[PDB]
Nucleic acid binder design. Structure first.
Length: 393
RNA sequence: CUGUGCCAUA
């Protein structure tokens, strides 16, 4: 516990306990890994520190490699470490340069381990955010380029490091992570993980020419475009596997749903969805994807999808009554109703596809009518019937 | 007869 010298007869930290007392004693490490003492320290180091208090603080908390790692990997001490790092960055004295270089080197030498650690990942994250960019880019360069990078992308802790890097580091400096991830085997592994798939979405988002990248110069936009194509190529080459997977389906969905990735939406729809609609519609995971394809397909593609269901080598009956498929039919139905009722754009390329939508609606209404008695036996079926009843409202 | 995730420190 906390050094005898620091306590009451009742074993309480003597109020009037000073930062300097702790720094002089050589016992800072004991307080920093204690819940109560750490809170004292964090309050203490936020005060007005003299030049020499900082000297001692810097040396004891971010100046010795082993203590630095011990505190960074500690449940309380990690907070103190981040706090001292910030003070170090706000202290424009002489040793400013040497201090940061050391810190950077301590961290680099243990990058993976610190990234994978519940508490040191927090030190990593705040360092990437707060260090001068040039230094921060050096932490990024310390990332493994082997199997360990996968481990990080899929770790509950370390995935946030990678996400932090995508938020605050220039693309030039992490381009390699993109190409690492677009590796068929890496793409496979990473998109199939509950943390990996968020990570991969976050990269795609950063790589997207949306309204959050309007500040990019033409150069930055070109670099961004190239990286996006490399990743999209890999992703489309495997859309079937990705679209049907329990985690990856969210990525396929994101892409299909995004107008700023229209062209990739279309590749996917053609690559793995088209001519597999009936099959994918009956799948737990890929059925949500099918819904998104119907909801976002350009009208000419939409027509091919509709025809596939109505008169593709019945399909409509299997889906209408399948545990998953039924959501697809409902979605088809809502799409056609909205279209007829002005809620949904029916023009594309200078031509109205209104008659097509009206043909699709006729087919659906006619089927629902004949299958009514049976559809009313089910929740899904009663919803279709209402959707149709609300048209006549 | 209803159908999927992650968003993590005292």
């Amino acid at each position: 516990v906390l050094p005898t010298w620091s306590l009451d007869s009742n074993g309480e930290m003597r109020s009037r306990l000073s930062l300097s007392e702790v720094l002089d004693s050589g016992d800072l490490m004991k307080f920093a890994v204690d819940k109560t003492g750490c809170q004292f320290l964090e309050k203490a180091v936020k005060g007005s520190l003299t030049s020499y208090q900082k000297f001692q603080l810097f040396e004891q908390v971010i100046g010795r490699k082993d203590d630095f790692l011990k505190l960074s990997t500690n449940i309380f001490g990690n907070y103190l470490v981040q706090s001292v790092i910030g003070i170090s960055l706000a202290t424009n004295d002489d040793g400013y340069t040497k201090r940061q270089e050391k810190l950077k080197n301590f961290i680099s030498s243990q990058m993976t381990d610190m990234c994978l650690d519940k508490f040191a990942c927090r030190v990593i994250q705040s360092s990437l955010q707060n260090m001068d960019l040039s230094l921060a880019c050096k932490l990024v360069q310390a990332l493994p380029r082997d199997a360990r990078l996968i481990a990080i992308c899929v770790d509950q802790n370390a995935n946030h490091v990678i996400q932090k890097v995508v938020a605050v580091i220039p693309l030039k400096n992490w381009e390699f992570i993109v190409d690492f991830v677009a590796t068929p085997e890496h793409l496979r592994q990473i998109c199939s993980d509950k943390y990996g798939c968020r990570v991969v979405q976050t990269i795609i988002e950063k790589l997207t020419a949306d309204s959050m990248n309007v500040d990019l110069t033409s150069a930055a936009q070109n670099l961004r475009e190239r990286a996006l194509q490399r990743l999209m190529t890999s992703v489309t080459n495997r859309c079937q596997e990705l679209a049907t997977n329990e985690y990856a389906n969210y990525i396929i969905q994101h892409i299909v749903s995004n107008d700023d990735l229209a062209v990739y939406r279309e590749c996917i729809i053609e690559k793995c969805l088209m001519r597999n609609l009936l099959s994918l519609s009956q799948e737990k995971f890929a059925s949500h994807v099918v819904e998104k394809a119907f909801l976002h397909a350009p009208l000419e593609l939409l027509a091919e999808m509709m025809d596939e269901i109505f008169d593709g080598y019945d399909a409509l009956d299997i889906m209408m009554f399948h545990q998953f498929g039924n959501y697809v039919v409902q979605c088809m139905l809502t799409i056609c109703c909205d279209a007829v009722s002005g809620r949904r754009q029916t023009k594309e390329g200078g031509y109205d596809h209104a008659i097509s939508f009206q043909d699709w609606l006729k087919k659906l209404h006619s089927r629902v009518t004949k299958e009514r008695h049976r559809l009313s036996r089910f929740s899904s079926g009663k919803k279709m019937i209402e959707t149709l009843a609300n048209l006549r409202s």
